[PDB]
Amino acid sequence: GIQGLLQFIKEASEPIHVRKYKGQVVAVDTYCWLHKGAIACAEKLAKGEPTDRYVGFCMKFVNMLLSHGIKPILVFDGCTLPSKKEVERSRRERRQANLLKGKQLLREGKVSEARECFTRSINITHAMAHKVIKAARSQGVDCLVAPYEADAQLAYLNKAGIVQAIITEDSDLLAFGCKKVILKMDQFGNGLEIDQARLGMCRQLGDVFTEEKFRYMCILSGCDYLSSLRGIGLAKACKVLRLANNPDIVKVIKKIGHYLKMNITVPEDYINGFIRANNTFLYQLVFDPIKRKLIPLNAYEDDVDPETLSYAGQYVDDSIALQIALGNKDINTFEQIDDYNPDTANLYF
DNA sequence: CGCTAGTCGTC
DNA sequence: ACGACTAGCG
């Protein structure tokens, strides 16, 4: 998530009820719901005991969207981007560290502090997501596992017009150019909608309301694909882009210290890391479910060599991507764990 | 004083 | 991993 973006653009937000989307399609960042579901049964999942509480939690939200006449499309995270492989294994280590600390606290009589530790010791596996997929498909709810980050797939579904809004706790969806994003939605259907159109209402932005300029601001402030330079937040990133009057973002970043009157010599790796973050937001691979084809989020522009963009997701045969998308092919082991076929029975029709 | 980043507390 | 919120910094 972009740190503190919701507050900076608070004027573009409005409180809504999901009733607003009766008769409309809405995609969900379902790993947000699986994580909260797995918190409610953290003590059992950590010890390896069998539990399907996280399934009922996601279904509580799905059935609520269906009650108000919304067609939900549950989107799941797929493979890890090459650049994020070192961080996800580091996260597995920190979860296994809290597994032993939670156990130690249960011995010391501190049951409530141990119950809190277990909530930060759970790995959301593709097996857990497949249980949710099977429960959602019984109720006739379409599910789509993204090839890589669900953030990019959700952005595709909205940009294509397949879905009119995205339900998520991640503000990166706005940096990805989503038209309507619904944050902080509770089990009853109440949440905050941020419309890209209403970014004009934000006096803090100035002219940093276009997709390209708004994306650059989020990257400069500190994004998932790149930490910011020290002392740069949304306010200072926003300031740099308003003052600069040059389309080449690279020349603006080299002269960043001049615009802010700050002592910042930008390193070699920050310029390239900015280009990679910008390329991941534009060209990260997604699955077109109607045509059943793996494609970049946006069609390649100007001189952008697709052979240099492996960090934004590697290509695989469309048949492999279809099997990942239907939840049949396990993300980690690439083993077929199911035989679902949409043609032998809709998002894929 | 505006802002950014480090500490306490929780889904 | 999320945000409240606060201190301390430029």
Ligand SMILES: C[C@@H](c1ccccc1)N1CN(c2ncc(Cl)c3ccncc23)n2ccc(=O)c(O)c2C1=O
């Ligand atoms: C795979 C998916 C995912 C994994 C498990 C549970 C919840 C979410 N992630 C991973 N990651 C995470 N986001 C949120 C939470 Cl609460 C996480 C908890 C544990 N481990 C990773 C998390 N993350 C970070 C920054 C992002 O910009 C982002 O898009 C994701 C993201 O979607």
Ligand SMILES: [Mg+2]
């Ligand atoms: Mg994500």
Ligand SMILES: [Mg+2]
């Ligand atoms: Mg993200």
Ligand code: NA
């Ligand atoms: Na920052």
Ligand code: NA
């Ligand atoms: Na300008």
